[PDB]
Design a protein around this ligand. Structure first.
Ligand SMILES: CCCCCCCCCCCCC/C=C/[C@H](O)[C@H](N)CO
Lengths: 246, 297, 246, 50, 246
């Protein structure tokens, strides 16, 4: 038995890792299907299981020596991907937790540390005209970037007035290049409602941001990519209609 | 004390071969149990080390969520008996009226299974094999015509007198087996026991059969184990006057009660000679087909 | 307890290793002395034990960046070596299994993988005059090389029409420079006879051949040697006569 | 058999949220037990992985 | 459980290490307070416990590629340091054992081996005028160097006619750069008396000396420091008077 060697099998997907930290269970609470006492919709939901509950590789950013960090908004990342997104479009109501496996590996002569974090209801603010006298709002491509994700305007402030200096409150996991090469976060369905639109509302936001900068000598590898992988758990859909998008 | 301890304890002379593995029954293909998702640290089936020398122990139930499958596919077709009980061509004996080949209605054939690639390669999969045999003899003319001739096949075991004539005195067959067939009759068929002095036939003898110096002269006898050299095969006309028809005899071998032992890689180059794994050096071919790029189909 | 750290003590010999793969038991069958029901010779055999059952270091090839691979034929390798070979010469009948410990170590900045394999009855063929129209046969120095061993004519074809592409059938073990630094193969007496000449017949052949080429930068060590070590197990000799050789 | 096994075993529809942690009472601040010197190999509290 | 990962907590001090050898218990005997049958003084001793029983960092030598090795004399090293030395000055009688944690770490591309040794009653001799015809004696700064310690005149001879060739008799521990990065020695009170002056007499001597020289290529770190840390155990003081020093 060991702590750093792990394997994650969901549906027909499988992730292996030999240099990891222990798995974080979000808020000390495993993802679950919705009870008959929490639910309110009378429709009999679809629980497609294997077809949608599986790992998805959606993006791969290049961690350069001077990067501000990126973020993704869930579950807008999958809405056009796979047979999960198909159910999320034909339906009004959706419910699921995720199994995020951020991954980034380098040599032993590289250094740097990422900060993987899952911040629920990550509302994004705008630079108010530089001076503070403009009630502007972010475009659709900033609040719902989707596949490619979005680069932070400023990383210190989390583009919302809140400090990254205390982001390790909500479920997080560091990727420190000298110890681990991947992070794994399991979150349950975090919402005040038993179901939600999945298109309009975004349950949380994945914040992949470096705090200690990537550095390396004149070695033989300057291209160090971070890759994002996720997998819906206990997925439920209700309120069937026509295919609707963004 | 008495006697010495390093003799009392000593495992010298231990007879039984210590078995690291026993055989289990597998009438049907393995069934598949149901599987669910698993997100744990420490339990990791997919990761393995090929360096060890073992095959992947990772089962499909731990690589993908699987359903239940009651597999009842039989494994009988894939057994040594049901794989080798297929009669194949192992010899062609020619008896022309007048040619370069045997012209007196008596041919001698030192019994060599090889010399015919299809039956050879199938057999060459294993190094040691032990089996009884069922030989069939098909006789006809070079056109395939059936003619009223009377042949005599004779089995000449090692050391027995070989026929030097169409009407040799050896054709009395007072002891060694011989068969009298007409071409009008259906193919003659005979069952043959395992008659090697060794526990098994060898398709490979990595050595010389004789002692002393092995100069460039006696270098062709390398790979010659007399244990699977079971003698010669002889055909008659029969005498005494020469035949009236051109004849062809084809020998077919069927194996039964087969027991092969150690497995061998499978030939990928053209066979060139009998009892000799030589190959064309400038015409070395890949084991299979090839494509233009590894990123295309 | 660990899997890669091993020690092999036979007679007055001892091999240590800290970076190994698990030991292969040939055909899942430990070497043993000949029963009274398998044997046929009436002579009371000699079982010299310790004196002959011990490790022998017989060769050390230099693994260059472009090598075809080598082989040895057993038990012709020891026939002139030690007090094992003495018994193998004065006697007609011989029986033993071996404990082969091929060894090759480099740095962590080297790469490459060897393939150690024990192929029983390894009969060697010749290039048939290049065209295929010559029934030539190998010299004595090719079929029975002995101490120094022999370099392959062609490695793809195993100098016998058979492909190396499927050599991992018979008992094998890889030496991959990034994981292990030695291979260990234990074979029993593999023959259709209870005893054999040991001079004329060769029970098997050790095939040490690289598949993934050795490679290294302009470091401080370009001389990477492979060393062959073997040890007879449960040795028996019968049919005593005068000293006879090749 | 009947019915299919991958439905019988299947944990689809599991209602209760599996709790990884339960709440304990803490009316007062945690008390401090006495400690002594310790010079051992293997027992190492201070070393941790953030 | 592991052997090389250790933690040493005494009083309000704490030493961690991840690349160590097992702890040496001196002469197979844990340090202890003085019995009422061994003692002879009738005074009721002070056993200040935590305040004096704790780790002290007193020196840090720079291990250069050509160094003869250094030594320290106990317990003269602490006499001016901390609240231990205060008790050792105001009192006539003293008793304690120590927990020495010599520490020195480098890369994996460095090489060299130190020899940590605790030699009781390490009396130091002088070069007798080079010729042998002078009964000179060492100065105070050589027999009682204290904080900074003293560099050996000659390391082969241990500046006393005795050979370092057999120093591994008394409790020792190697610091070999390719395996460990720290040594730990626990000694009890080694003396023929239950108590002694602590100023006049020195129970033993710590000998930190390299045998296999430090070496490294033109890397990015040539400054490799050895640091000495110690901690009094079961400290007792008796015979109270005024503050007296060297
Ligand atoms: C009435 C005639 C019956 C003839 C009986 C012949 C039975 C012979 C059994 C087959 C023996 C093995 C065949 C020989 C092996 C290969 O051809 C070569 N020796 C390979 O070196």
């Amino acid at each position: 038995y060991s702590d750093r060697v792990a394997q994650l099998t969901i549906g027909n997907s499988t992730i292996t890792t030999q240099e990891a930290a222990n798995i974080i269970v979000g808020y000390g609470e495993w993802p679950s299907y919705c009870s008959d006492s929490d639910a309110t919709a009378v429709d009999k939901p679809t629980r497609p299981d294997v077809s949608v509950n599986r790992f998805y590789t959606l993006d791969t950013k290049l961690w350069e020596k001077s990067s501000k960090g990126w973020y993704w908004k869930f579950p807008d990342v999958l809405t056009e991907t796979g047979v999960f997104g198909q159910n999320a479009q034909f339906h009004y109501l959706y419910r699921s937790g995720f199994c995020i496996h951020v991954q980034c590996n380098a040599s032993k002569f590289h250094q740097g540390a990422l900060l993987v974090a899952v911040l629920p209801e990550y509302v994004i603010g705008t630079v108010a005209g530089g001076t503070g006298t403009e009630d502007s709002h972010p475009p659709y491509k900033q609040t719902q970037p989707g596949a490619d994700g979005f680069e932070l305007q400023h990383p210190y402030v989390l583009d919302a007035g809140i400090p990254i200096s205390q982001l390790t409150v909500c479920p997080h996991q560091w990727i420190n290049l000298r110890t681990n090469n991947c992070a794994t976060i399991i979150v349950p369905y975090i919402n005040a409602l038993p179901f939600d639109s999945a298109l309009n509302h975004c349950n949380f936001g994945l914040l992949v941001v470096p705090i200690s900068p990537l550095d390396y000598d004149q070695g033989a590898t300057p291209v160090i990519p971070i890759t994002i992988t996720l997998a819906p758990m206990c997925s439920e859909f209700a309120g069937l209609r026509q295919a609707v998008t963004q | 004390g008495d006697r010495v301890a390093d003799v009392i304890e000593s495992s010298i002379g231990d007879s039984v071969s210590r078995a690291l593995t026993h055989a289990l029954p597998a009438p049907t293909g393995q069934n598949t149990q149901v599987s669910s998702h698993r997100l744990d640290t420490g339990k990791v089936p997919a990761l393995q080390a090929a360096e060890i020398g073992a095959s992947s122990n990772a089962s499909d139930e731990s690589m993908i969520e699987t359903r239940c499958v009651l597999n009842s596919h039989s494994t009988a077709e894939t057994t040594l008996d049901s794989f080798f009980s297929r009669a194949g061509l192992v010899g062609e004996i020619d008896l022309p009226l007048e040619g370069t080949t045997n012209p007196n209605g008596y041919a001698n054939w030192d019994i060599d299974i090889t010399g015919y690639a299809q039956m050879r390669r199938k057999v060459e999969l294993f190094t040691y094999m032990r089996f009884d045999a069922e030989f069939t003899f098909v006789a006809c003319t070079p056109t395939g015509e059936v003619v009223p001739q009377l042949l005599q096949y004779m089995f000449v075991p090692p050391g027995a007198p070989k026929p030097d004539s169409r009407e040799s005195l050896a054709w009395q067959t007072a002891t060694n087996p011989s068969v009298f067939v007409k071409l009008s009759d259906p193919p003659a068929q005979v069952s043959v026991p395992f008659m090697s002095p060794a526990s098994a036939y060898q398709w490979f003898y990595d050595g010389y059969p004789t002692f002393g110096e092995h100069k460039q002269e006696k270098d062709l006898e390398y790979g010659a184990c007399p244990n699977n050299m079971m003698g010669t095969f002889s055909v008659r006309t029969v005498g005494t006057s020469k035949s009236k028809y051109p004849l062809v005899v084809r020998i077919y071998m069927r194996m039964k009660h087969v027991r092969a032992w150690i497995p061998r890689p499978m030939r990928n180059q053209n066979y060139l000679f009998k009892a000799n794994p030589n190959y064309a050096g400038n015409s070395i071919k890949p084991t299979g087909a090839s494509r233009t790029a590894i990123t295309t189909l």
